[PDB]
Each structure stands twice: as C-alpha cells, then as structure tokens.
Amino acid sequence: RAANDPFTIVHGNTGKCIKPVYGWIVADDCDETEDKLWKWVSQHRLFHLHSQKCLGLNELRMFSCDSSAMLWWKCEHHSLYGAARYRLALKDGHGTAISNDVWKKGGSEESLCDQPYHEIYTRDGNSYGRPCEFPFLIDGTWHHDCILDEDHSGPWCATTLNYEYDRKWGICLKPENGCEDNWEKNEQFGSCYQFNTQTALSWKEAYVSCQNQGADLLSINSAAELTYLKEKEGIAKIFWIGLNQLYSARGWEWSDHKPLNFLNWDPDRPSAPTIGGSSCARMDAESGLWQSFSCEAQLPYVCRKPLNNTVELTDVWTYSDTRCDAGWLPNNGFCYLLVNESNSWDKAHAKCKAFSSDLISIHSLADVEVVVTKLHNEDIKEEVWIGLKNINIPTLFQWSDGTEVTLTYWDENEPNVPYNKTPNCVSYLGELGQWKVQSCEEKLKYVCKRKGEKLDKMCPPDEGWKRHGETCYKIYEDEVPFGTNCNLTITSRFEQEYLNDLMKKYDKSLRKYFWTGLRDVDSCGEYNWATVGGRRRAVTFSNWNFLEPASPGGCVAMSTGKSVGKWEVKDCRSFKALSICKKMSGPLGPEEASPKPDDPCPEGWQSFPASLSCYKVFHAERIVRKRNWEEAERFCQALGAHLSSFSHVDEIKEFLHFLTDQFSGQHWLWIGLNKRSPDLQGSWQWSDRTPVSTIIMPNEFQQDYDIRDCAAVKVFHRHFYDDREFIYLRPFACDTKLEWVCQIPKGRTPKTPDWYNPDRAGIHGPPLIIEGSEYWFVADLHLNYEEAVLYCASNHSFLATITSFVGLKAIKNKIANISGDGQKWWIRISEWPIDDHFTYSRYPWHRFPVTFGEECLYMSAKTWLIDLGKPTDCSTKLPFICEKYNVSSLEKYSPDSAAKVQCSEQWIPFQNKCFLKIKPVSLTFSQASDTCHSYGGTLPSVLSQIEQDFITSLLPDMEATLWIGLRWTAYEKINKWTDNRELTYSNFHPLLVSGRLRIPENFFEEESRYHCALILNLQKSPFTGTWNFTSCSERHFVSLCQKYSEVKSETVKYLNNLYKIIPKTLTWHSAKRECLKSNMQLVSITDPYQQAFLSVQALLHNSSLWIGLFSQDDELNFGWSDGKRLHFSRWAETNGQLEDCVVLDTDGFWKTVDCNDNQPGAICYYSGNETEKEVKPVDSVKCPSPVLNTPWIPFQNCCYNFIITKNRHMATTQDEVHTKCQKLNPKSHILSIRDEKENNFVLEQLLYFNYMASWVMLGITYRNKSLMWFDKTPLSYTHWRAGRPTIKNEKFLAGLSTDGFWDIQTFKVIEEAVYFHQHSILACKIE
Ligand SMILES: *[C@@H]1O[C@H](CO)[C@@H](O[C@@H]2O[C@H](CO)[C@@H](O[C@@H]3O[C@H](CO)[C@@H](O)[C@H](O)[C@@H]3O)[C@H](O)[C@H]2NC(C)=O)[C@H](O)[C@H]1NC(C)=O
Ligand SMILES: *[C@@H]1O[C@H](CO)[C@@H](O)[C@H](O)[C@H]1NC(C)=O
C-alpha cells in the first residue's frame, strides 16, 4: 500500500518540537499531539490538520493557502529552503527565516523528504480517474482527505486546485481490508475484482492506482478467467491487463509476479521489432484479444486483489553435494546435461526421454542460475531446447513433466506466437539465458534433466556456515564499524537472491542491516567495491532502494524487513550492521577488457578521447520531430546503439562539457536512466544493462514522482538531472561502443543511395503531379508509419501532404496505375499545408490533462472517398510517397526600394512593411482589391505569426470582419497570396473551420467557383484573429491595406491597461519586486488582444520578457501571479512546459524557462480603469444513482451517460439505441444537442476517450421527410462539416466527431457501417 501519514516537525540542534498558533511559532509543549499535525500537500506546501492553514512567509505565519505568497518549500540536504535561497529557522521558540539548521520528523530520522508523496486516484465521476488534489475548499472549510457525505456515493475528493470554479470530483480509492465494499469478493477464480470504467489513465498511472490499494493489475492465466472477463456486464470494451515489457532485456512480464504461460496475442499485429513497436499490452473485451499498444495512452483498467493471500515459500536455495552417472552435471540433487548433436524438439524429447530423464523444466531462479553459470559460459553461441510446449487454443504453455508453471524467463522481446501454428516450442538464447519461440523443426542442441540420489573439511558447516555449491557464506554475530575483518562483494542477481534468502532465514524481525563492501574511499560520488589487497573487481550488478543515492560518501548495508536486500546507504562513520562473507571469488570475472581507447568512430560519430564510446546527438531542428523517452530509445536501438550511459562519475561531466560546445541555447536531452519497470520497485536502471553506481539524481519532493520515471539531462552555455515523464517530447543523443558497429535500417544515413538512385528515377520517369510538386512513389518497400515518416522527411523532402482534390484524384490515378486498387499508402490528408513546427493542437477553453494520440491516416486506390478520414492501425508496413519542398526563402522581387518607400501620417509601419486603415464600409473581394489599389499598396498578406498579432492588435478599432485578401479556386491548393508570395502558414482553427478535405460533387463541367478568406472579430471570444474561408461573391468590411517600405524599416496605455516594459536583466522574483516597486504587478494575459499587443511590443524590443505566469505544482498546473484563472493560453508546444517560470518570446509564444535565470526584460501591468473579478458558477443539479459502472455527469440541468461498455447489437440501430437508453434508465432519451455550450461539453467528454472512440452517436432521423431528433421536436441548432447533408432515406448514422462537427454516414447494407459503430459512444441524456 501507499499513503501519506501525518507527521510532526522536530529540530535537530535543539532536540524539541514545533507548535503553530494563530500568531507565530510558540513553545513546543508537544508529545501530546492532539493539538498539532503536519502533512505534505500539493504545490510543495505544509498543511496543519488543526488550524487548517498552510505555513508560509520576512515573518513566518500560517496563511490560508488559497493565495500566492511564496507558499512552498523544498528539499535540501536536511533542511528546508523557500523561494530564493531562503531557509527555515526558529529563535527562542519563535520561527523566522534565516536564509543560511536541520529539521527532522517526529519519532524518526529523516528530513521530511525521504518518503515520496503518494497521491491517491479516483474511481469514477466527472474527472475520469484523475488523482486527488488536497486541500480543497468546501463550505468555507479546507479538507485534506476524502470526505463521506450522504449525498454522493462514498469517499469522494476534488481533483483540481479550485473545486468551486471547476466542480470536478471523484470517488476515492482507499485501501480496504476486505473485498466487500467497492469490490467483488468472488471471481473466477480465487480473487476479487474491481472494474472501474471511464478512467483515462496511462499504464503506469493505472498500475500505481491498483498498487496503492494493495492489489495489482489484471492477470489472465487460464481460459476460464478470460471467458469470465468476456461475459462481464460492467466492463470496458478496451482496457489494460498489466502485461508489459518495461525492463531492458526481458521479453514480456505480468504486472504481478505471475508466470506468463497463457498467451492470446492478436494475429493481425506484425510485431514491429524496434521502431513502431510498444512495450505495454492492451486487452479488447469484445473478442478478448491482446495487442501491444503504446502505453503512453489513456485507457481504462481493472484492479485484481488476491482473496485471502498467503505468504507461502519453499526451500528453493539449498545445498546437496551429490554425485551423478559420470558426466551429468550435478546441481541441488538434480543432473542437467545437454546433447551436442543437432536434433528437433519432439525427436530429441523422445530420444533423451527413454533414459531415466526427460526434457528440462525451470520452476524458479535456481534452474536459471544453473543454466547461466554452467553450460560453457551461458551458451555463448548456442541454441538449446527446453521442455515447454503448447498445443491448446488459445496458447497455454505447459511443461513436458510437471504440475504447474511458476517462472517464465522470456527474451526481449518475442514470445511471438504465430497465427497458423499448432506446435509451439521454446529455446534458449541471450547472455542471460532467456527463452524465445521456435518451430519444432530446426536442428539445434537440447538439454534435459534427471532426478539424482542424495549423498570435506575445507568448509565445515558446524559453526553456522552455509554452503552454496562452490563458495560458502558465513554470518557474524555483531560488528559496529565497517569492515572490521571482512567486506562482502556481490557479482550478479542470483547471488543477491541467495543472500536475500539466507538473510530472511537467519533473522526473524526487521531493522537489522547487513554490511556490504561497497563504498567510495575518495568521496567522489562513484561507488566501488572495497579492495582487500590487489582486487579491483568492477561493479557488475546493483540494486538500490527507491531513492538510495543521496550522499557523495558513506557505506552501504542491506535491509531485511520488507526492502529485502536493497542496498541502503548509511553513515560509514558510526552505524551498526551485521556482516556476511564468502570464501572464494572469481579469478576470471574482472579480468576482461573488451573496449579499446584507440578504435575510432565508424562514420560521423563525434567523441572525445576520454569517453571510449562514440556519440551521435540529434538536435531539435535536424530531426523530423522530438519524441518521447521510449521512442528515442527505440530510434537509438534501430541504429544499433542505446541512450548515453556513463560508468564513472567523471565521464558524465566530460560528456556534458563535450556536448555543451555543440549547443548555443539550453535544452534538455534524454538519458538511459529510467525506473519504468515494475520489477525495479522504484530503483533506477540503465537501458543498456549496466549497473548504476554513481549519484546522478537529487531528491525533489515532486507530487507525481511515481509517474515521471525517466531521467533528463540539462546543458548550460557556461550536472543538473531531472525526472521527466515518459510522455514528454525531447531531443536525445545515442551512443555506441568503441568496438561495436552500428546499424542502418533504411533511416537517416542509408539514404545515401536512396538520395541518388530513387530520387533520379522519380525525377526522370514520374512527371509532376497536377497542381503540386514532385511526388516520389516509394513502393516495393513496406514500412511502418514512423519509419515512413523518417524515410520521407529529409533536408528538403518530407511526407506527402494532400490538401487539394485535384492532387487527390491525381495520386489516386497514379496508385491505381502503379500498384493496384488493393494496396494502401500512408498519406497525410488535410485542407491547408500544416507546419510540423506548430501543431496548433491547443484547446482554446481550458488546458485539461489529456494527451492526444497520433493521427496516422492511409488511403487506397479504390474506396478512397470513404477511407480518407478513417485512421488505421498504423503499426503496419505499407508503401508511401514523399513530397518535395520548393524554394521558400530564395525568391527575391520588388526591385523598387527608395521609390515606393513612402510612410505618411496615414500609415503605421511594422517589420519591413506598413499598413493603412480605411472606413469600415462593406465591399466584396473583387471590389476591395481595387479599393486597396486606389491607395499605394496591397491587401494585408500574413506570412508570420507576429504580423497576424499586429493585425489582431489593430482589429479592436475596426469592424467585426476584415478582408485578409487571399483567393484560391475551390478544391485546389492556395497560392500567390494575392502578392506573389509563397504561402508559409495559415491560421484556420479546426474548431471553427473544418480541417478535413472537402469532397465536391463529382459532376461539375465548368462551375469552378472561387474561395476567399477573412479575419473575424468575434467580440470577446477566444478565436478572434482566426481566418475563415467563404465564397467571396458576398461582401464584408475592409479596413486594411499593406505596402512595402524599405529605407525606413514608457507607460503604454492600451484597452484600459497600463503596461511598463522594464529593460533590466533580472530574474522573475526580482521582476515581480520591481513591478511592485512601481505600484504595479506582472502582466496577466487573459485575452488575445493583450497577447498580440505584448507580442508586437516584445518584437519591438527584440528580446523575450518576463510575464506573470508561474508554476508551483512541479510544472503541472500554471497560474497567474494576480490570482486569475488560466483560460487563455498561447503555448508554443503541446507538451513543452519543461521548466517552472514563463516568459513571452519574440514570436508571440509563451516560452518556459527556470526563473533562476537572466532574461533581458520584464513586463508590468496595471488595471485601474477596469477591475472586474466577479465570477462564480452555480451547480445545483444532482444526478441519479450510477448504473453499470457509468455515472451520470451533470451539465446545465441535465445528466449525460457516455456508455463506454460492451455493445454489439447493431440491427436497426434507430429504435435499438432508443430501447437501450430506455431500459437502462427511464426518463432518459438519446443525446440531442440543442445549444452551443452543450456541443462543447460533449466534445470535452469525448476528448477524454480519444484513444478508443472517435464519434458520439446522435439521435438524428429523417421522419416526415426532414432531419429531426427522435423526440417530437425540430432541429434548431446544427453544426455540420461542409453544408447541410442530402440524406433522403432513413438508414444513416449521425455522429458528433472529435472536432465538434457532426458527420453523417449513409449506408445500403447494415453490415457495411460497422466501423462507425465500433468507434461510437452511446450517450443518453435525461433533461
Ligand atoms: C465562416 O464562413 C462560413 C461560410 O462558408 C459561414 O457559414 C455560413 O454561415 C451562415 C450563418 O449561419 C449560414 O447562413 C445560414 O444558412 C442557413 C441555411 O439553412 C439558414 O437557415 C440561416 O437562416 C442562415 O441564413 C450559411 O449557410 C453558412 N454557409 C455558407 C456557405 O454561407 C460561417 O458561419 C463562418 N463562421 C462564423 C463563425 O461566422
Ligand atoms: C436550470 O433551471 C433553473 C431553474 O428552472 C434556471 O434558472 C436555469 O437557467 C436552468 N439552466 C439553464 C442552463 O437554462
């Protein structure tokens, strides 16, 4: 389990207590804690359970923590420091900061920081399982734990910071003693289940949620459990199963420690080996099939707790020096032997079965230890059979002779059960002796095992001396100092497990440590084994505790209570621990030097002579795009390398000093360290199977330390390591050994012949596609989506983006002529050319925690009109085509420099251009053209973001619509920008203008209408400045013309606001102090007008300036220094908030930097003319009881139920869905949106399930020859994609999409639109 326990603060120098009262700190008088209790809460704050106030600051006092008054503390060595190098101290009883003491727990010896913050998750509600956020304010009272009232279901908490303004709650998930409440005390069989649906949680988050309750994730071991999970009523259609491979070199493991014998892998997944693959599994409940999906997603899960669990063990680590039949290797009473002759599986089984033996069987780590240590150096170059076969359907591995499987040791990463294969065989490979699949038809060696009979003064066990087979172990009575007579050195994990069993058998209670000969004599941070004289055995194995490395000096010991064998670090000066040793050692173990410091790098890899390894760094501009930790590791493995993993503590600083020369700005990089695997139990590990031995990470008391399990390194332009999640995108740097060769799997470098042969072949034969650049048709080479994108993307070439219907028809004809009407091709279909730099996938109303998936599309030669907006399983090998970039920044025109340069008083100048305003009179586009031509210039053409910001800042005084002035023929691309300028970017919000491709009527002789664009002034809406396209035969207002001018390329008042640009180079705290010195505060941008004005003002200064945006919750939730809700945001990236404080870049985007830095300016604001902050939502609607684990979320006098559950009845869905919503709960019909805010609410609820559902079913019919809802009511409000539909029949499916638009799929056969039914949600409102 895991929970936060209330504690007390104790001083170290003066060994007494703490006492907060209304005014200040007073005399302790504690040891009667009925009047004081402290607990850590969010934002690194301390909360008192008695006064219900949070401590803060320079007089220290208890303030209500609904304020921004530097209410946060940090984790020092053994003390606490505040905002900027502050400190916490007391003087004569009263506490006051000192800025230069230690504080420990009550009844313990640690700095209030060693135990990580264990947050709790929620089960169901309007939050979808998001973790709690304590404290929360209700009825004027601050609650720090889950409450229990007669209104809600059970223990429920608030999941966000401000509960009053969000009204998002969730039923808590607390550890229970039995499986009676919120569980199912019986299952199939011998466990209790908890099916929590509607919870968009990642794999690691779901595992942490199931583990905090003492249980674990799912575990399927027999077909009975599978068929019980299939026929369960309240279960999600797709969820997690805990099956994962998050280790370095392990095949596939269960979440809980259970053997993997029953496999149900989907036969459609091609099992992408390195790029495009995954490491966590996923279960589909409709067919009950297993897939390998990228477990960075957000899918529901299910917890499983063993019913009446018992701690049963055995004598798995014993000793028996028995003899065998003169040649059979004896080990622990058994005899193993492998035949050197080539044989099959069944034939060899029958061969060595005729003796008094049969094929080998591995039940625990003893057999694995035998297989690895013996067998001629773990069978360096060999393949050996093993008596595990499968003939059942589904797959269920079983031993040749046995009763039950108990340990599975797979090879990373291929259990690899074929589709059409009745016999399934396993074999040995790898330096760790792991298992892979075979065909029971290859000729390779085999091993088998015999039960032998039971049977020197060099090792007398008379004095309590245990034996292991080659080297005995001996424990001593007591030893206070370190290494009194002996120090122990461990070499591998099997020796560690033997030592753990010996320690558990020796002692009977907890809190007795055993010494270990690992220390740092030089106090250099790197740990090495103690030298007993002429011994320099390097560290080959390491297993620390959760966060053990904390001091660059000390001595290690081994705990035995629950952290069995975890190498803890204690003071090597004075600390008592027991001692264990061995007699023999390894003479040939540390005698090996494989790398050589004289071998150079193969090609292009840079390295310094003090590295013995070649490096290859991937900058943030050369690559196709940044990627997550797992994607970076897979990209490094594809090239034959891994992430940078240093052995010594000087190599890290040398590598940092070597990379900081290749960088100008500061940006994080990926590293091999990660604690993602559940078997590590919190300890770190290197991805290349190298034991961690140095202090690399500090101890930051983060709120989600269990979730962020990846290590990121920071470079400076002058060794700071942080813990990032496995979802953030980040550049990386692979590294290879000085003697090993790299790989080239059709990626970056092996494009060298792919830049000459196919490029010229496509430039010669294939002509230019109609209305577009050249398209190279990469066929006869099937690659995944990630591999196709990596192949197409180059210095100029990239993945083919289709934005026109003419180009669509051309590529369709070329595909039909080249490959056929059956093959599929990877195409990125859109309406306007999208920029890979700015994804524009930012929600405008709120920043809710949902990571959207990848939109990897496809298209075929036939059925292209239907499958153009349907995503596929893009871990598939298919041909593709690559497009070519043209000369963008190479065209030069406008030779007139001093003649046309004329900026009069009716002209506002900006960067290399100038604008002029006219009256807001209304004219069409063809008239507005000559209206601007009446003056000298052109219509306003936008080529960058800051020009759009300048236009937006000029917009408030203009009309509600402006003619931007770019025209294009309908159903084609956009060019010429009315001024012979290449279209760089376009600002079309996908929530207002449908980003999908437009499909016209296929019968049009010459009716080629034109489409023009305009800028909207949406009157306080967050979409002002965006562009909208329309048939410009109509007329709109015109208030702007642009021209080019060459020779001439304080307290500011703006929209009832006073802005001051401080040019001082200072931090964010000093900036806030300087703003407060002028009776002002840091600017809080709450509207796009202020954002655009501040952006153009920052461009006028050519440097990024500070703003009033900062974070306290470990960069999870941002907020303004004024106490204003973050509603408007213009971040530069989706997941780019990598540091704490915020600055406003010159390009108009909010950059994020750690505000312990120097920025060349800041922005202070003052609001005196307009001071309005009165906003409070009212929620007085209570929904009925939840049904089938699907609650009713209230919204505006209604109760919606997005039924994400097993449903396959798709026969006459019109009445079927209605009866389904009816018998589920009366007084509730199908969903029918009749407003605009309701559509946004439905879209928000859909976006939480964007990984398993892309549409929400709507109740649209065609009764009485008109589109109307199921109820007797007309259809007032509608949100279509492109015009009103033309549905004449009544057989069609209406679905609210993931962009707010309503799509309609018509069909003639009911069994043809099942793809729309598989990805739909059945919502039944109440009203
Ligand atoms: C962005 O531009 C598009 C134009 O392509 C705008 O779509 C147009 O919006 C108007 C306003 O609602 C529609 O007029 C309505 O037509 C229905 C047809 O049944 C009629 O019943 C209403 O009384 C009203 O006249 C118009 O049909 C629609 N489409 C076109 C081609 O003009 C869109 O509104 C613009 N976006 C924003 C935010 O204004
Ligand atoms: C809900 O009902 C109350 C009282 O009938 C009404 O004041 C309120 O406007 C309703 N909500 C909406 C969104 O109309």
Residue numbers in the entry: 30 to 86, 93 to 135, 138 to 492, 498 to 760, 767 to 1097, 1106 to 1383
Which passages does the manuscript contain on this structure?
DEC-205 (CD205), a member of the macrophage mannose receptor protein family, is the prototypic endocytic receptor of dendritic cells, whose ligands include phosphorothioated cytosine–guanosine oligonucleotides, a motif often seen in bacterial or viral DNA. The MR protein family is characterized by a conserved domain architecture that comprises an N-terminal cysteine-rich (CysR) domain, a fibronectin type II (FNII) domain, and 8 or 10 contiguous C-type lectin-like domains (CTLDs). Here, DEC-205 is thought to function as a promiscuous endocytic receptor that captures a diverse repertoire of foreign and self-antigens and internalize them for antigen processing and cross-presentation. Namely, DEC-205, PLA2R, and the avian IgY receptor FcRY are all reported to exist in a compact conformation at low pH and transition to an extended state under basic conditions, although the mechanism of such rearrangements are unknown.
Given that DEC-205 adopts a compact conformation at low pH, we prepared samples for single-particle cryo-EM data collection at pH 6.0 consistent with early late endosomes where DEC-205 traffics. The structure of the DEC-205 ECD was determined to a resolution of 3.2 Å. The DEC-205 ECD domains pack tightly together presenting in a lemniscate (∞) with dimensions of roughly 110 × 70 × 70 Å. Each of the tightly packed DEC-205 ECDs could be built from the N-terminal CysR (R30) to CTLD8 (E1383); however, the C-terminal CTLD 9 and 10 were invisible in the reconstruction. The centrally located and globular CysR and FNII domains lead into a compact 60 Å ring with a central cavity of ∼15 Å comprised of a counter-clockwise arrangement of CTLD1 through to CTLD4. The second and slightly larger ∼65 Å ring comprises of a clockwise arrangement of CTLD5 through to CTLD8. Here, the central cavity of the second ring was occupied by an extended loop of CTLD5. Each of the CTLDs adopted a compact β2-3 loop architecture with the exclusion of CTLD5 that stood in stark contrast with a fully extended β2-3 loop that played a role in coordinating the secondary CTLD ring and thus in stabilizing the DEC-205 ECD. Most striking was the extended β2-3 loop of CTLD5, which acted as a “recruitment hub”, whereby it co-ordinated several domains within the secondary ring including CTLDs 6, 7, and 8. Here, R895 seemed to tether the loop apex via sidechain interaction with a neutral pocket composed of L1172, N1173, and Q1193 within CTLD7 with peripheral interaction between W893 and H1183, which further stabilized the extended long-loop conformation.
